[PDB]
Write a protein that binds this ligand. Structure first.
Ligand SMILES: CS(=O)(=O)N(CC(N)=O)c1cccc(CC(=O)Nc2ccc3nc(N)[nH]c3c2)c1
Ligand SMILES: [Ca+2]
Ligand SMILES: [Cl-]
Ligand SMILES: [Cl-]
Lengths: 250, 58
């Protein structure tokens, strides 16, 4: 995250850290005790699918304070329409091997109904994006979880204001074009969380952008509203052997 | 009332029904109050609420 602030410990309790052989991979969002939403592109280069770990309740990567909970990732589910090396359909649903325990520091973000998300949440101007990604373009990643308030653009306005992948109906733009504030590499997969009448909801996944905080460009987010029914059906399904699962979309 | 305008007055989810009818609904871990619009937690850690902040103003 560029130009944000430290998320006070426990104020981003849905944030997930994904590790591969102990190394930072990506962010994610807890939506239930066994389910995490992340970005499909995070998994393009995974060689050993059995060494993926999700950490909940993380805050400061330099220390162990006892609020962290680690789980093996049992399943990574990606839409059939996602193509490795590209940006469209950038979503993954992760099943944890055992539930996390909900605590003051570990709480799911609400996965909204589609209608609600499209008709109401899509018009809330500002939402929060968070992660342990790079603090600057070409810079070091953060040791403490960072958070940033970003405004959402209608896609017509993003294309107009921006000056190369298309912005598809499975994406939306958010952020600033003045080079000051943005999500960045290493924040991929993390939440774009939207507040409405006292409750927070998952509306986007940190997906891509032209550099980070690049003048004339905005961050691009996976438009989670397009995937609600796809996610809900998968969460009702039995697990299948083998970590990676490609599931038909729609 | 209609779900497209002002979320049908619902705090959370809204369904339109035949005639001038509307039903609000709440996420798992919440219940709908008698006002027909408000949702109140039914569990200790409902989704989308931040415990340290909910305790700070309780
Ligand atoms: C090139 S590829 O399509 O092949 N692929 C590689 C791969 N094989 O995974 C890939 C796909 C999507 C994103 C990325 C990196 C990326 O853009 N991160 C990022 C995240 C958030 C951001 N916010 C801003 N403002 N910029 C951001 C940048 C790589
Ligand atoms: Ca820690
Ligand atoms: Cl099934
Ligand atoms: Cl496997």
């Amino acid at each position: 995250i560029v130009g944000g602030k430290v998320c006070p410990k426990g104020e981003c309790p849905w944030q997930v850290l994904l590790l591969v052989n102990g190394a930072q991979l990506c962010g994610g969002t807890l939506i239930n005790t066994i389910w995490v939403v992340s970005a499909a592109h995070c998994f393009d280069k995974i060689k050993n699918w059995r060494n993926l770990i999700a950490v909940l309740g993380e805050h400061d990567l330099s220390e162990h304070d006892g609020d962290e909970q680690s789980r093996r990732v049992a399943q990574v589910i990606i839409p059939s329409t996602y193509v490795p090396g590209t940006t469209n359909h950038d979503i993954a649903l992760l099943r944890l091997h055992q539930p996390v325990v909900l605590t003051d520091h570990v709480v799911p973000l609400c996965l909204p109904e589609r209608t609600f998300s499209e008709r109401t949440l899509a018009f809330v101007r500002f939402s929060l994006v968070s992660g342990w990604g790079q603090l600057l373009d070409r810079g070091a990643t953060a040791l403490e979880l960072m958070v940033l308030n970003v405004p959402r653009l209608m896609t017509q306005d993003c294309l107009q204001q921006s000056r190369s992948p298309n912005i598809t109906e499975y994406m939306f733009c958010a952020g600033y074009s003045d080079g000051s504030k943005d999500s960045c590499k290493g924040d991929s997969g993390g939440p774009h969380a939207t507040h409405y009448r006292g409750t927070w909801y998952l509306t986007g996944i940190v997906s891509w952008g032209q550099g980070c905080a690049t003048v004339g460009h905005f961050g691009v987010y996976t438009r989670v509203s397009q995937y609600i029914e796809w996610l809900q059906k998968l969460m009702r399904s039995e697990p299948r052997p083998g970590v990676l699962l490609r599931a038909p979309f729609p | 009332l209609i779900c497209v305008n002002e979320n049908g007055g619902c705090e959370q989810y809204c369904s339109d029904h035949t005639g001038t009818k509307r039903s609000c609904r709440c996420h798992e871990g919440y219940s709908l109050l008698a006002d027909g619009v408000s949702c109140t937690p039914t569990v200790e850690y409902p989704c989308g609420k931040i415990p340290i902040l909910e305790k700070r103003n309780a």
